[PDB]
Amino acid sequence: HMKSKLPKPVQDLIKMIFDVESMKKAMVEYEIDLQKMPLGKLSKRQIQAAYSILSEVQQAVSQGSDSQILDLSNRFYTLIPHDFGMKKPPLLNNADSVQAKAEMLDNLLDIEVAYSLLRGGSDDSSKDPIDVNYEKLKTDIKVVDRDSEEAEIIRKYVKNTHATTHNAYDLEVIDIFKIEREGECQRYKPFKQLHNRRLLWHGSRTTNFAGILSQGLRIAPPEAPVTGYMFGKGIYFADMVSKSANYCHTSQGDPIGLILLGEVALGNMYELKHASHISKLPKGKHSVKGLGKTTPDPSANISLDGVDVPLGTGISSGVNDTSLLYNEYIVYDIAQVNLKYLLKLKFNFKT
Ligand SMILES: O=C(c1cc(Cn2c(=O)[nH]c(=O)c3ccccc32)ccc1F)N1CCN(CC(F)(F)F)CC1
């Protein structure tokens, strides 16, 4: 084929995100049975129905028996086959089980998108499939130059916001990309001038990235159990790189991850300290801020293209009896995010 004119790092990025074997690896990591539920048999309506059953299990847990629950638990395993042999699978009887499976279903939702892009589409052996796959993202991706001003600010954000409690690894920034999802600038227009616009981190496993870049960051669907998400069904960000970077789920065995930087229109924050499984915001609020015990030093906030970058070292927030060690931000309308950058990270596991 014609061999592809995209920069090496952009090509390596497309290779990672569309990797089929990585998709399967993630599925077995969640205990799915690939013989009963292969990648190609994944569908939306099956994920949705599984989300529904998990909402049934949530109802029964909220109202308190291991016996009346057995039936609900079993229905979930009927819909999403797990790898337990001739079995008896573990009982889904608590809040932890609902959170754990809801996460699993979130990931399947993005993997189904990635796989559908790979199998929709046309087949032309004279084209570099790198080029073919890039185009399916409907996202302009450029390499940010190491000596630019935006590179220096991003590297400082990474450098300053690695929490001491996440010191089991550190991060090197391998490549910084600037990304522009088609139509997203247009979608964000209503919020483009809102107060409290912040540049924030969103980490996810590499196998979700094709979905995120084609569809943007999305909210978990109606069917999904609201209780599976600490502040309900929104899009979640951090101001500490290490808190987002933990959601990459990298390891010694695959230590390259991907992390986003999004412009997030927070406006008037509904500030909270403990779990609140809300489905709408109080009138007049635009976001939730989960209040951390530690925050980037407010006084070291800097500007990048008109947007606040909270890149200070962590200090005490002064907030007292909170569930959260670090800040968390949630928006509940997809149009309040505009994705700006994508970092490829190398994780040095010190353990
Ligand atoms: O932002 C999230 C989300 C993400 C997390 C976990 N999480 C996370 O995965 N990455 C983070 O950087 C993060 C930062 C602060 C707090 C939580 C974070 C927990 C609940 C959530 F609702 N979602 C849910 C999965 N969504 C995909 C879909 F299933 F709905 F499609 C993307 C939006």
Is 244 near ligand 1, meaning CB less than 6 Å away? yes
Way the structure was solved: X-ray
Q: Does residue 180 carry a catalytic annotation?
A: no
Rounded CA-CA distance 327/325 in Å is: 7
3-state secondary structure of 1: coil
Pairing outcome for strands 314-316 and 324-326? unpaired
Compute the distance from residue 213 Cα to the ligand 1 centre, in Å: 15
Ligand 1 atom at shortest distance from the alpha carbon of 235 = 1
- The contacts of residue 290 (CB under 8 Å, 6+ apart) are 230, 231, 272, 273, 323, 324, 327, 328, 329, 330
- The contacts of residue 59 (CB under 8 Å, 6+ apart) are none
Mutate which of 105, 106, 334, 342 to test ligand 1's pocket (most atoms within 8 Å of Cβ)?
Answer: 106
H or E stretch covering 244: helix 241-245
H or E stretch covering 103: helix 95-119
Ligand 1 atom at shortest distance from the alpha carbon of 330 = 1
4 marked as part of a ligand binding site = no
Compute the distance from residue 236 Cα to the ligand 1 centre, in Å: 5
Is 220 near ligand 1, meaning CB less than 6 Å away? yes
Is 57 near ligand 1, meaning CB less than 6 Å away? no
Q: Which residue's alpha carbon is nearest to atom 10 within ligand 1?
A: 203
Tokens read off for 66: 């291991």
How many CB atoms are located within 10 Å of the residue 94 CB?
12
Q: Which residue's alpha carbon is nearest to atom 18 within ligand 1?
A: 236
- The contacts of residue 334 (CB under 8 Å, 6+ apart) are 187, 216, 217, 218, 219, 235
Mutate which of 47, 158, 236, 276 to test ligand 1's pocket (most atoms within 8 Å of Cβ)?
Answer: 236
Rounded CA-CA distance 223/220 in Å is: 8
Rounded CA-CA distance 250/255 in Å is: 5
Domains annotated on the chain, with CATH: 1-137 (no CATH), 138-350 (3.90.228.10)
Q: Which residue's alpha carbon is nearest to atom 23 within ligand 1?
A: 235
Query: How many degrees, rounded to 5, is the angle at CA 56 between CA 55 and CA 61?
Result: 95
Is the CB of residue 312 less than 8 Å from the CB of residue 239? no
Q: Which residue's alpha carbon is nearest to atom 16 within ligand 1?
A: 236
Ligand 1 atom at shortest distance from the alpha carbon of 201 = 12
Rounded CA-CA distance 9/342 in Å is: 12
Query: In units of Å, what resolution does this entry have?
Result: 2.2
Compute the distance from residue 249 Cα to the ligand 1 centre, in Å: 13
211 marked as part of a ligand binding site = yes
Tokens read off for 40: 């190609």
Is 239 near ligand 1, meaning CB less than 6 Å away? no
318 marked as part of a ligand binding site = no
Ligand 1 atom at shortest distance from the alpha carbon of 203 = 12
Is 202 near ligand 1, meaning CB less than 6 Å away? yes
253 marked as part of a ligand binding site = no
Rounded CA-CA distance 89/85 in Å is: 9
Rounded CA-CA distance 76/55 in Å is: 10
202 marked as part of a ligand binding site = yes
DSSP string, 246-305: GGG--BTTB-EEEEEEEEEE--SEEEESS----SS--TT--EEEE-EEEEE-GGG-EEET
276 marked as part of a ligand binding site = no
Q: Which residues pair with 198 in a beta bridge?
A: 264, 308
Give the CA distances from residue 11 to residues 3, 76, 141, 143, in Å, rounded to whole numbers and listed in that order.
Answer: 11, 39, 10, 11
Is the CB of residue 325 less than 8 Å from the CB of residue 292? yes
Is the CB of residue 313 less than 8 Å from the CB of residue 297? yes
